[PDB]
């Protein structure tokens, strides 16, 4: 199985420089060429470069002219690309895939690399429960839910009774205030369910290496 | 540069039926050695680019048949034979002919299924959040259909705009409806000067917005 794995999301000051990586497995790493395509929040794609391990050879989207270089290292199978003098306008989400051959296209993509270019400190999420309140709330099915609120930068995971709990889920895209993103997520169980099975949000916080179990109690 | 124009959206599709997306080019994609330097991809939500179509026809491997691509060369066509729930999403059309290689805008396909109306559910701020100065409502509304809402709060009867944050998430790859969370910040201490809260939904299901509420005390 060809396989992408792409380092972990950053989060780094404007005016420095980061380099991420794309180790890949499955397939003669020497005799493909490796692409690189940004997605900025809420925008399409845009191409940065391409290049050939087996002779060091890459193609490059002069829009990026002094902002981005590519490179191979052969004896682990990873492609690596560096990007330099870093403004927010370089926030986004980084893909790199393979080309499947002559001219057809990216078959293989690595899960992406987030990149935040940003002053700000990173801080770690609240998490607030959300519990029935006052209003008796239907009868058949009772919905919960879980604030995330007060955190820098993204992303976060969430998952619900540690990803044994996945139906009926719906965790919304954070949204950025004040220099900090908040985030909620609710789930809907049956309510003869609730509270006999109990219910917890976890809320995985990387950057801050932070993770916070909150159980919803009535 | 060139540019590959795609409609932003595409009608609503029955679940089952026939679509089509296209995509026109700033200028002819076929090489002089003959090849077509064309490719359709499909992002879904939260997910990584999957090749659907490359070299203007040629179904990638990893692809179902359902999806099958045609073109004049300067004109291009991704047809979807039984459309299904899981392929919502968006469907960009890229080319590589030229540098610096380059993707159209991508094309949103949505599913028209059943009108739903949204169950609301609204939280008072939690004892944790208060302690802290802080004091947030949470609104619900989840799986309606079609994705038009508008929602509204109102503190002791009046309407407040300020301090509210909503987010949507995409239409369902099962269900096919939309979600909606809106949440009122306040501080504790404006919080704690009103009785009533109250989140108003309005929807194409009903006459009368939903609405959810709750006292203080
Ligand atoms: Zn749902
Ligand atoms: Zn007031």
């Known amino acids: 199985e060809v396989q992408l794995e792409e380092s972990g999301p950053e989060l780094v000051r404007p005016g420095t420089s980061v380099k991420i990586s794309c180790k890949a497995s499955?397939?003669?790493?020497?005799?493909?060429?490796l692409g690189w395509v940004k997605q900025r929040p809420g925008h399409g794609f845009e191409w940065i470069g391409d290049?050939?391990?087996?002779?060091?050879?890459?193609t490059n989207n002069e829009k990026f002219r002094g902002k981005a270089i590519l490179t191979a290292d052969t004896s682990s199978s990873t492609a690596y690309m560096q990007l330099s003098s870093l403004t927010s306008e370089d926030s986004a989400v980084y893909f790199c895939?393979?080309?499947?051959?002559?001219?057809?296209?990216?078959?293989?993509w690595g899960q992406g690399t987030s990149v935040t270019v940003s002053s700000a400190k990173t801080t770690p999420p609240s998490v607030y429960p959300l519990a029935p309140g006052s209003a008796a709330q239907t009868n058949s099915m009772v919905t919960l839910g879980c604030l995330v609120k007060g955190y820098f930068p993204e992303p976060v995971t969430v998952t619900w009774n540690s990803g044994s709990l996945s139906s009926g889920v719906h965790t919304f895209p954070a949204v950025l205030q004040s220099d900090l993103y908040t985030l909620s997520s609710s789930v809907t169980v049956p309510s003869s369910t609730w509270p006999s099975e109990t219910v917890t949000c976890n809320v995985a916080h990387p950057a801050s290496s932070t993770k916070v179990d909150k159980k919803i109690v009535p | 540069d060139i540019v590959l124009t795609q409609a932003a959206f595409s009608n609503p599709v029955t679940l089952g039926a026939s679509a089509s997306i296209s995509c026109r080019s700033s200028?002819?994609?076929?090489?002089?050695?003959?090849?077509?330097?064309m490719y359709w991809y499909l992002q879904k939500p939260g997910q990584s680019p999957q090749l659907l179509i490359y070299?203007?026809?040629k179904l990638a491997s990893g692809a179902p048949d359902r999806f099958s691509g045609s073109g004049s060369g300067t004109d291009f066509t991704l047809r979807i034979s039984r459309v299904e729930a899981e392929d919502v999403g968006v469907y960009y059309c890229?080319?590589?002919?030229?540098?610096?290689?380059?993707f159209g805008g991508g094309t949103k396909l949505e599913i028209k299924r059943a009108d739903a109306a949204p169950t609301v559910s609204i939280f008072p701020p939690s004892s944790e959040q208060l302690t802290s100065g802080g004091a947030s409502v949470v609104c619900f509304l989840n799986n309606f259909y079609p994705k038009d809402i508008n929602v509204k709060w109102k503190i002791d009867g009046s309407e407040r705009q300020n301090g509210v944050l909503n987010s949507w998430t995409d239409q369902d790859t099962k269900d096919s409806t939309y979600s909606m969370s809106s949440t009122l910040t306040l501080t504790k201490d404006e919080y704690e000067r009103h009785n009533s809260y109250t989140c108003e939904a309005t929807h194409k299901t009903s006459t009368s917005p939903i609405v959810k509420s709750f006292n203080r005390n």
């Open positions: 499955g397939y003669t790493f020497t005799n493909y060429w």
């Open positions: 290049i050939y391990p087996g002779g060091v050879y890459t």
């Open positions: 070299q203007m026809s």
């Open positions: 890229a080319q590589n002919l030229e540098l610096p290689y380059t």
């Open positions: 200028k002819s994609l076929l090489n002089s050695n003959g090849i077509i330097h």
């Open positions: 895939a393979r080309a499947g051959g002559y001219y057809t296209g990216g078959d293989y």
